[PDB]
Amino acid sequence: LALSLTADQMVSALLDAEPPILYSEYDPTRPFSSMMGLLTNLADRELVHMINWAKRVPGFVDLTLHDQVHLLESAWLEILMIGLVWRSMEHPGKLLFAPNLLLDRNQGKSVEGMVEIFDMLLATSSRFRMMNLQGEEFVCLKSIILLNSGVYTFLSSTLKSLEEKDHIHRVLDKITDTLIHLMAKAGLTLQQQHQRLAQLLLILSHIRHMSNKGMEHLYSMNVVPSYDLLLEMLD
Amino acid sequence: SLTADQMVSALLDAEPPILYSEYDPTRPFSMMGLLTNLADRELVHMINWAKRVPGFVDLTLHDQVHLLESAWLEILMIGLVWRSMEHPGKLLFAPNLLLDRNQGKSVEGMVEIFDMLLATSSRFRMMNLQGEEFVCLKSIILLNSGVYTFLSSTLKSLEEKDHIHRVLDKITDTLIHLMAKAGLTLQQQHQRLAQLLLILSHIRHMSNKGMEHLYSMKSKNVVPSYDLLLEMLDAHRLH
Ligand SMILES: CCCN(C)C(=O)CCCCCCCCCS[C@@H]1Cc2cc(O)ccc2[C@H]2CC[C@]3(C)[C@@H](O)CC[C@H]3[C@@H]21
Ligand SMILES: CCCN(C)C(=O)CCCCCCCCCS[C@@H]1Cc2cc(O)ccc2[C@H]2CC[C@]3(C)[C@@H](O)CC[C@H]3[C@@H]21
Secondary structure (H helix, E strand, O other): OHHHOOHHHHHHHHHHOOOOOOOOOOOOOOOOOOHHHHHHHHHHHHHHHHHHHHOOOOOHHHOOHHHHHHHHHHHHHHHHHHHHHHHOOOOOOEEEEEOOEEEEHHHHOOOOOHHHHHHHHHHHHHHHHHHOOOHHHHHHHHHHHHHHOOHHHOOOOOHHHHHHHHHHHHHHHHHHHHHHHHHHHOOOOHHHHHHHHHHHHHHHHHHHHHHHHHHHHHHOOOOOOOHHHHHHHHO | OOOHHHHHHHHHHOOOOOOOOOOOOOOOOOHHHHHHHHHHHHHHHHHHHHHOOOOHHHOOHHHHHHHHHHHHHHHHHHHHHHHOOOOOOEEEEEOOEEEEHHHHOOOOOHHHHHHHHHHHHHHHHHOOOOHHHHHHHHHHHHHHOOOOOOOOOOHHHHHHHHHHHHHHHHHHHHHHHHHHHOOOOHHHHHHHHHHHHHHHHHHHHHHHHHHHHHHHOOOHHHOOOHHHHHHHHOOOOOO
16 A cells, blocks of 8 residues: 555645644743753654654555664654754754744853754755755655664664565655655756755755764753653554 | 766776774774774775765865765765675675674663664665665765755855755666666666655764664763874865
């Protein structure tokens, strides 16, 4: 069923699955002063919706529950970050963590080590802006992250695991076909399609890098979702 | 200006040598010392290779240093994974230093990283990665890994970033040219392109884990400094 979709059906499926944009929970009539608490509460609530989204990525629920957990455990911070960079794209110099929580780099200075991470995310959003990234390409990229980030770290060679990895790579191939279809439908030449495909996928390496830095930042001060919590939520 | 075949030839011709580990092979078999000493010597040849990547020496010295500082561990790792491709279960750090995962257990925290490198090597084997594709990917890592972290918007920096992306576009054309000449269909071409580039995200992840391991081992002194990279890159032309 998953591998059956056309490119337009894949795009429609991914667009329909998009999670909502959440708001930060602070009293807006109360003075602003808490930063780490605001950001981690927001990511808390986003995670529940991320799982709903992931279950709607075609092919994802065809995997074992264990492999769904592994994929999400590996990708969750990358997925939060690409979403942040996407909605920050039209706010140069600012990160739209939430519509009521738009921060510039000086506001990241209030937590040691955070402005460095703010700077990388702002630069990624400028790269998105520079490339005129489209919403349809964005949902493809976010789905690629979900399927790709953990696929090389199963460290299992059971027959089931071979079939799982094969399936994941088949879905990833369909998403590649879909990105190419979208750039063809936008008028790009074949050369430009291959070049833009590459430019988009290379950005995913930097998003991986930012996630690793962000994980180190977190670890340097139970904020990380445990396997068991992810398992319970995915059930 | 290069054609695809000329890009391939340039990169193949620039390949660094394969170095040996320096340990007396007639003495009993230090693990971190062996691996540190090898990477230290590979770095010098990495600089030589980088200067031969088309477009690289057209950048400012500062930007050359930034790219190498950002990419150096990824470049060592992709080389290791390529060398290990035909040795299932083993990592050929050097022809005289072929280690399995149990030998990684001697350094706390190292077997986790060995497992990731072995799985990447298995992935290369499953994709039947070719030598011409490998050199393309390694050059992409050099050009891509630090291009998003210049943290500069001077006119010169905009020109540098534009140039890097033009060279990266050229390597993309070359990868597609290689798979077209291998007979792959257009659908297969963009699928293989994507599979190869997505492996570069995992190589980035492994480098982050490896840096973190180097720092936790208190082997931070082993990371090449900005000054050291600058000193080796800022060559005179008196020789
Ligand atoms: C015991 C009771 C309390 N519990 C159980 C909890 O609170 C649950 C905690 C477990 C689930 C997830 C919490 C951690 C996620 C917080 S990331 C935090 C919020 C966030 C939201 C987004 O859209 C995009 C990115 C980010 C992050 C970008 C990288 C940052 C900037 C880092 O540099 C430091 C903060 C990071 C931000
Ligand atoms: C300070 C002032 C100026 N100076 C003097 C300097 O900067 C000196 C800096 C000289 C650079 C020396 C580099 C040492 C880096 C050692 S990587 C070490 C050797 C190596 C060689 C390869 O082919 C491929 C991968 C690796 C690595 C894969 C990840 C490992 C397994 C980690 O898990 C722990 C060891 C890592 C390995």
